[PDB]
Write a protein that binds this ligand. Sequence first.
Ligand SMILES: Oc1cc2ccccc2cc1O
Length: 222
Amino acid sequence: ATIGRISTGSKSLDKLLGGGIETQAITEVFGEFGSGKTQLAHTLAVMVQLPPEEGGLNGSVMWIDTENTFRPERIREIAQNRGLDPDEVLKHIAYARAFNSNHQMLLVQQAEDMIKELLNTDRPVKLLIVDSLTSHFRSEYIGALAERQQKLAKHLADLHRLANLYDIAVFVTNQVQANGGHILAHSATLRVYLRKGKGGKRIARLIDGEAVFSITEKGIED
Ligand SMILES: Oc1cc2ccccc2cc1O
């Protein structure tokens, strides 16, 4: 398949990304608590449902939530201010809460079943969100870094296999603050550092110019 791109909702961020986040790729956004990573996830879950003329892929979404941070009412607001029907947008997001890191790993295998089911339809899965990818692994493997890295590595390999095999954009969030961080090392296809700036602006930079945007009723925008 050719590489598809999903607009983020921000012209600035899209330019930094070469058009949007890519299918057949893992995009990792990392930054401190409150930097806006989950707002970007919510916005992408709407944008991907637009036609390509508007920066989408007519795609379905699968969302793995590790922190109980998915908000359907926020999806509704973004959809209504992106000219989409909110009920339809929500009906094309498959949602699951991961109870721990082992369940999170099983959910990725379960996602493949729904991906296969939708593959030849008019609304194939085009976006898989894992928010937050690292939170359970971090809490469960305190004092056991070597074992944590083994399990994360297999989890990321599973996500890569899905991105490439099924032409999906995988979007993952990672909280990194004071003294913290191996990030995801070099595993993601693309690492995006997100931070708060003056006056509530958000600033994004590729790791390995900068885009600036705001969180609004449209999700994010310039
Ligand atoms: O109904 C489902 C929703 C999911 C969401 C994310 C990951 C896996 C899922 C599997 C399902 O059957």
